Design a protein around this ligand. Structure first.
Ligand SMILES: COc1ccccc1Oc1nccc(-c2c(-c3ccc(F)cc3)ncn2C2CCNCC2)n1
Ligand SMILES: [Cl-]
Length: 127
């Protein structure tokens, strides 16, 4: 089945702001996750056509990936850090819903998620 368009990453009509926490989410969290050895399947939308997963977008109706998150952060798409954190969590959750526990892709997600949680533990206070 066709892939859907990727998630919106820029909205001219949606107010913008920079905060310490959003800067940290881009320059620390996204950066560190991106460089992880297991990051590659998470760096762009799931290409269900290429991967021959005709049921992927029948099951997953709230897709997310780190390529989209990088753009949202760069485009100052988020008003607050919680919106961005939610996107990371959605990305991991989708992986867990579609796949079986113990599958390689799930172990990979779990490694990134642990790293993610470690980094959000050190989220700066919104000074
Ligand atoms: C470990 O990745 C792969 C393994 C074998 C073949 C291709 C692979 O690449 C890949 N790229 C993007 C997504 C996925 C993926 C996701 C996926 C990845 C990220 C995400 F956020 C959500 C789902 N869920 C399942 N898969 C594959 C499908 C083929 N059989 C092995 C798992 N795999
Ligand atoms: Cl596996």
């Amino acid at each position: 089945s066709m892939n859907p368009p990727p998630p919106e990453t820029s909205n001219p009509n949606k107010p913008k702001r920079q905060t310490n926490q959003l800067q940290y989410l881009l320059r620390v969290v996204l950066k560190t996750l991106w460089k992880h050895q297991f990051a590659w399947p998470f760096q762009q939308p799931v290409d269900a056509v290429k991967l021959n997963l005709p049921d992927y977008y029948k099951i997953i109706k709230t897709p997310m990936d780190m390529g989209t998150i990088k753009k949202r952060l760069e485009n100052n798409y988020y008003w607050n850090a919680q919106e961005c954190i939610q996107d990371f969590n959605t990305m991991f959750t989708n992986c867990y819903i579609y796949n079986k526990p113990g599958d390689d892709i799930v172990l990979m997600a779990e490694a990134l998620e642990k790293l993610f949680l470690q980094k959000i533990n050190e989220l700066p206070t919104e000074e």
